Write a protein that binds this ligand. Structure first.
Ligand SMILES: CC(C)(COP(=O)(O)OP(=O)(O)OC[C@H]1O[C@@H](n2cnc3c(N)ncnc32)[C@H](O)[C@@H]1OP(=O)(O)O)[C@@H](O)C(=O)NCCC(=O)NCCS
Ligand SMILES: CC(C)(COP(=O)(O)OP(=O)(O)OC[C@H]1O[C@@H](n2cnc3c(N)ncnc32)[C@H](O)[C@@H]1OP(=O)(O)O)[C@@H](O)C(=O)NCCC(=O)NCCS
Ligand SMILES: CC(C)(COP(=O)(O)OP(=O)(O)OC[C@H]1O[C@@H](n2cnc3c(N)ncnc32)[C@H](O)[C@@H]1OP(=O)(O)O)[C@@H](O)C(=O)NCCC(=O)NCCS
Ligand SMILES: *C(=O)CCCC[C@@H]1SC[C@@H]2NC(=O)N[C@@H]21
Ligand SMILES: *C(=O)CCCC[C@@H]1SC[C@@H]2NC(=O)N[C@@H]21
Lengths: 506, 212, 506, 212, 166
């Protein structure tokens, strides 16, 4: 029937040609263009194309656009099943109505039932004001399904436009949030209400723009230049992730060699203890082909999280970054690493940790901000993990920070150390000041005590003698040791005690 | 500024980018866990190569170990190499001429340097190229001609002087915080008008060190 | 044997008589006195009384004190088995050594195996500096057992002295932290290092005192005047809590009547919508005998969490407090309520929620602080819970805040509303300004439309017609309805999908 | 200041406190989940009643439904009442004399008012009383002579005048924020020295409203 | 660093050259030679090479030998993961101390967690007399691991020397 094709073409128009032209003039793709770019060619099957809202308040009965402002369906990304929904900004500003939320709920239920990833593309305005509390009920159903799917299937949210009001809480409960720079923003309350209440004049970009949520608020996991780059990076990320919490990490044929040595790593650690180095260089020289998908790269840059591949299999990486804040652990880095470790453990992704940390960040700002619980979050995530854990200490591991950074005491499977590792309670000077507090009023005796303590304890060998370090390895064999360790540890079987859930501090 | 490719250099760079994209796609199509056998799919031969605002409509045809790249104007250029991802240099033959091309990682593409020319290379399908054409060209903002100190600490060394020209990526000062040095680098190009902070001073967050 | 009794008496002296006297001169009890006060008379059995350290560094071999700075064992509180450890401040400053941590690990393992609560009493210094990395390893073992026991047995930490360095992370992962005012403090980094690094001068009280951790940092769940009051309140809390995640809430004979009506509640809600009221009064008139154990009373006072009893059984309560910040939801209140709800769900404690919330707190400070994820925490906790959930709307429930506050859309079992409830997307004025944005310039028309919207939608009846509210009830029947609902819901059986754990935002 | 109980009033208050403590302990010992049978246990009859810095050594003996309280000097004060926890008034007979005591629960005790006398009542065992005697008497630091505004908002009303003496727990001003009023109350005692703000003024946090 | 390689070479000597020569004169291989012969070429990864005892009784503090009389680790046999430990007869007669038993317990826990076979090579004397009841406690921990792994992973014991006492 030509009438069916005509109705399909009418439904594909969304709001109208003028709305789509405005969307393109903003530099943004349409919802259907985004879906087409995300999925494999010809793989998209659309659900609920002709769904219409049933509201009769405020003259809504005269505006019935098929689809109700969201395009839902499923397809394949690199041949693997994915479910997705893309909000159509041209239809009532992408606002969520009862039928809109019903379509989203259908796609969420299908994704959870089929144990496949679900992708959310957000370019909307929130609950539709004309529909009243029905929109809120639909939002609540979507939230309930987001919580049900958490830790079962990977959930990815892509913010490619406005996201305000109750709309933001659905991406917040997903695993990863990505934003498009200069065209997307997220906030619970809009600039107008902020002005009316707090008398503060702020634009949408200054309130919830990509930079704010990628570098300050810990909300977004990354930002991209435009829609095309963001969607291509989403496709790239999907190739790293397991489809669910059962199938395990995907495998590809690796062009790299697991037995290659990296002689340049033998000179990575500077002789001067005060001289920093780039840990990202070590990570990118360890992973296959130097390919690393970094997570939250712009936020809490004293730590590094991201996905690489070792021998063709996805591996999570956590590493202190000495280039930023001397690589100390603060609240922001602790929360970032904790969430990343929790995700990796929930989906059976092994974690490799590179440790160079002198301790925690001091000050009243950290203590008043809850650094105790925030650091306990990372400690809890590491101690809870049952995936393989391989830890490499490069230069420093002091005290509680050493304990937290996936030490053997919290359940690490293999703990290696470079010859430059320094595993101690604290620095030599402070340890001497505490132990020899009675003779702190000297100049040569204090120096002799400090030198003796440095020679005895500022090394990896006290830990090695206690068995806390499995082996002191040469830096050039790091990748080979990691690959062999992960290959052996693939069969790890461990279980936490039976519980409804843990009580990790929030 | 490195000149953009033009003529045979541009053609060779586009062919190499297409070959690298083909190799990466062939490896990518072998991922496990697919819904059905990946052999039951087809590769879209038509491709678009964008070399820093320069389009090339090309076709990639697997012919044995080497790859055959055919351009719009009838010309074909076989590509043969043993390059593997992660190798910094692409070495092989394009057509019947040996070539060495630097390959650098790029988001959704590769940065290529050859024969004195450099360009960012992205390979799309025709539909992907059409969609990418809709994306705007965004202009950077810059810095307010001041070197704000990003972290509190003590200034250790200043390697610049007033009325001295600095380019982007040039170190400007070293600030040590908690027994760890931090090398500050220029984010723009210009001359340092004056120096405010001095070696031994303790600065704070958003403190003026020098003006451009 | 008289020699055995003499050795026991010598071990009971801890550090020395002078150090015990100094402890008493600070107004603090000794560790053994605190254990005696906590447990039922004559019920304490002590483990590892004669354990001593094996360190030979820095002359430690000449200081061998039995117990190694901690008293461990088990007893009964009101006849119910509890395990406990109390750090002895007189022995090396309470610092944690290898044998010290081994004793703590033994008591933790016993508590987990027996499925009994474990109480930690902290008056210490952290890791013992003279023992090096062995103390860190012991701390790591303690942390691992804290994480393993999370959500299985209730873990209570009582801070009755200094708690510095790596010591603070064990209480941080427990369920509840209580502090003694003017004598206890907690911080990751001490004042001396803070002065050295950040150049600011702070005392121990200013950095980590009881007030800071009860009102600013979200660390402590409460503070008490002295040791005796704190320990008695700990006994009371233990009477409130289940022994493990299997046995359910304890039951006592209630002196109150579940069928009594409270006529005073019919006048609790002021006629003026801008006038607040005390929600704590409603909570204390609903619970049995007006007995309510509030949790985190001094922190995020726009929300209320705590334990009460209905018909002699423990019930958790969450309620917006209109007296503070108009009862809005912000990051602090969201995190507090989310942690409380997670604890209640983990241990099969039903939750009653009183809702009067106009929305979320606006401003750049909230958005930059991550209000999206912090509110998502409470939404996640409510949507995840499988314990009975009873919700009562008193005055206001607007938008996303209405969704989050245990609405039927996120899994609430019974949702009641008072006649003064106002369930809507937003206020009438803003809704009219959005719906009728084209004609905002006509004052009389705007007022008429605002009045019409207020009549139509600022009521509980639109939600009642959609089935979102089970029944609009009289305020004087609130306790009777709650008691009957909980009695019916005791047999509730539901489960989340199979997973290692969720990925709740942190 | 309400006077502390003296003589027979203090004895009656101590007897009432002991009876309430006995009733609460008897109910408490019936909790479920105990390791062994609660009946296979003994209750320590000797108690110490601390009555606003005044100690009474008493013995509680249940003579059937009622309770018998015996003091150090040998006097016995039988206690008979039907009071239940949560009831604001304790009504019954203490030593063949009907009494009415206001009961306001507090932490680990009760606040009692009777015959014009008020006192905080806590019941310990002898060991618990001995341990509680080790606790220090902490003094409140008080508050400064300035009334800062705890929240930003608009001042709607001020119920105090210039040079007016106020006591603790008395309203001082009303501040409205986010369409909700907030009644501010005096935390100390002192005449108002100056009023810095009036109606219609928008004030931020930690802003001086009135000075004592 | 050459110092790390020197420390490894010193740890590989066990008791001393004379003890190893006496071991070879009995027709017996060393513990490391036995491990090398058992595993696929180049597959052995050693745990706790530098572990030493912490005893201070009867002059034991003057005899700190890296490894504490046992070589532990994992490898492959015909490409399949196996865990193993070989008691070094040259170090205190192969006797089991606290750190010795801790290394054995680590390898047993790894074998059980990874669901791989564990091979025990015994050339020893029993519990180290100088390390009191701590040696007995370590033996008990090893026994508990043996019982926990029974019927889950195959456990193979090879007696290549004295095996006495506990
Ligand atoms: C999401 C938001 C930031 C979008 O930014 P914006 O483009 O500058 O705002 P717009 O008015 O142009 O939104 C586009 C359309 O979608 C509509 N819309 C947006 N959000 C909506 C919602 N939650 N419900 C119903 N309609 C909505 C708008 O009415 C508008 O309609 P119009 O083009 O015919 O005039 C903003 O619209 C918003 O916050 N919406 C939530 C509801 C609200 O509070 N609106 C007033 C604040 S401006
Ligand atoms: C916990 C702490 C705040 C206690 O406050 P304090 O009473 O004012 O400090 P004190 O020196 O008096 O501690 C009491 C004793 O316990 C010892 N002690 C405290 N913490 C210790 C530790 N982690 N390891 C070993 N010994 C420790 C102290 O050396 C001291 O010994 P002393 O009485 O013979 O002089 C503080 O001691 C501390 O931070 N300890 C951790 C280690 C440290 O950094 N010490 C230097 C900071 S003061
Ligand atoms: C196991 C055993 C049969 C080995 O046979 P052996 O070679 O003839 O006996 P050795 O004395 O030569 O043992 C070799 C060394 O290991 C030591 N050793 C052996 N078993 C030990 C143990 N359980 N604890 C500590 N050291 C031990 C021996 O002291 C001896 O030390 P040395 O060479 O410096 O003299 C025998 O040593 C034994 O039974 N040891 C257990 C302890 C014991 O009972 N010893 C006395 C019986 S001989
Ligand atoms: C000297 O400058 C101070 C050294 C001790 C403090 C440093 S700051 C970062 C590390 N974290 C910590 O707690 N101490 C270390
Ligand atoms: C008028 O004064 C402003 C009313 C709308 C803002 C108020 S502030 C607290 C509530 N939260 C929110 O987002 N809006 C409400």
């Amino acid at each position: 029937l030509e009438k069916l094709e005509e109705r399909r073409a009418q439904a594909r128009l969304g709001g109208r040609e003028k709305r789509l032209e405005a969307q393109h003039k903003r530099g943004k793709l349409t919802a259907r263009e985004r879906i087409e770019l995300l999925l494999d060619h010809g793989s998209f099957e659309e659900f609920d194309m002709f769904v219409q809202h049933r509201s009769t308040d405020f003259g809504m009965e005269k505006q019935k656009i098929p689809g109700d402002g969201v395009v839902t369906g499923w397809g394949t990304v690199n041949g693997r099943t994915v479910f997705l929904f893309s909000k159509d900004f041209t239809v009532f500003g992408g606002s969520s109505s009862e039928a809109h939320a019903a379509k989203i709920v259908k796609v969420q239920d299908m994704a959870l039932k089929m144990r496949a990833p679900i992708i959310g593309i957000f370019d909307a305005g929130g609950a539709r004001i004309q529909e009243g509390v029905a929109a809120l009920g639909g939002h609540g159903e979507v939230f309930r399904r987001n919580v049900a799917a958490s830790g079962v299937i990977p959930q990815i949210s892509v913010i490619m436009g406005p996201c305000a009001g109750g709309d933001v809480y659905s991406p917040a409960m997903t695993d990863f949030i990505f934003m498009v720079r200069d065209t997307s923003y997220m906030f619970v309350t809009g600039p107008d209400v902020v002005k009316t209440v707090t008398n503060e004049v702020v634009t949408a970009e200054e309130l919830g723009g990509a930079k704010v949520h990628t570098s300050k608020s810990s909300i977004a996991d990354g930002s991209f230049e435009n829609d095309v780059e963001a969607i291509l990076q989403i496709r790239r990320l999907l190739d790293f992730l397991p489809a669910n919490n059962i199938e395990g990490v995907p495998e590809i044929e690796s062009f790299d060699d697991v037995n290659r040595l990296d002689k340049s790593l033998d000179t990575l650690i500077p002789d001067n203890p005060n001289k920093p180095y780039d840990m990202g260089e070590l990570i990118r020289r360890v992973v296959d082909e130097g390919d690393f998908f970094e997570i939250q790269a712009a936020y809490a840059r004293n730590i590094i999280t991201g996905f690489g591949r070792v021998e063709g299999r996805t591996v999570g990486f956590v590493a202190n970054q000495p280039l930023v804040l001397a690589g100390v652990l603060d609240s922001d880095a602790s929360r970032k690493a904790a969430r990343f470790v929790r995700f990796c453990n929930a989906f059976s992704i092994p974690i490799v940790t590179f440790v160079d940390v002198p301790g925690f960040l001091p000050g009243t700002a950290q203590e008043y901000g809850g650094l105790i619980k925030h650091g306990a979050k990372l400690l809890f995530a590491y101690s809870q993990a049952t995936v393989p854990l391989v830890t490499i200490i490069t230069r420093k591991a002091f005290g509680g920070a050493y304990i937290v950074m996936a030490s053997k005491h919290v359940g690490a499977d293999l703990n290696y150390a470079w010859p430059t590792a320094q595993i101690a309670v604290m620095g030599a000077k402070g340890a001497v000041e505490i132990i020899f507090r009675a003779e702190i009023g000297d100049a040569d005796k204090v120096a002799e005590r400090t030198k003796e303590y440095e020679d005895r304890f500022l090394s990896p060998f006290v830990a090695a003698e206690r068995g806390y370090i499995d082996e002191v390895i040469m830096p050039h064999s790091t990748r080979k040791r990691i690959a062999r360790a992960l290959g052996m540890l693939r069969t790890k079987e461990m279980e936490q005690p039976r519980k409804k859930h843990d009580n990790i501090p929030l | 500024i490195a000149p953009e490719p033009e003529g045979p250099v541009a053609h060779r760079l586009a062919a190499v980018a297409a070959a690298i994209d083909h190799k990466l796609n062939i490896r990518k199509r072998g991922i496990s866990g697919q819904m059905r056998d990946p052999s039951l799919l087809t590769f879209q031969r038509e491709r678009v190569v964008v070399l820093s605002g320069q389009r090339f409509n090309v076709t990639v045809d697997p012919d044995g170990d080497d790859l055959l790249v055919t351009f719009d104007d009838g010309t074909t250029a076989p590509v043969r190499s043993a390059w593997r991802p992660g190798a910094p240099v692409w070495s092989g033959t394009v057509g019947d001429q040996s070539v060495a091309i630097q390959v650098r990682p790029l988001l959704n593409g590769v940065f290529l340097q050859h024969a004195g020319a450099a360009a960012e290379a992205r390979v799309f399908t025709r539909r992907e190229a059409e969609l990418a054409d809709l994306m705007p060209v965004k202009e950077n903002a810059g810095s307010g001609k001041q070197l704000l100190c990003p972290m509190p600490g003590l200034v250790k060394q200043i390697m610049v002087s007033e009325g001295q020209e600095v380019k982007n990526g040039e170190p400007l000062a070293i600030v040590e915080a908690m027994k760890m040095e931090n090398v500050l680098r220029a984010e723009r190009d210009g001359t340092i008008s004056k120096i405010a902070a001095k070696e031994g001073d303790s600065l704070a967050v958003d403190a003026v060190i020098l003006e451009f």
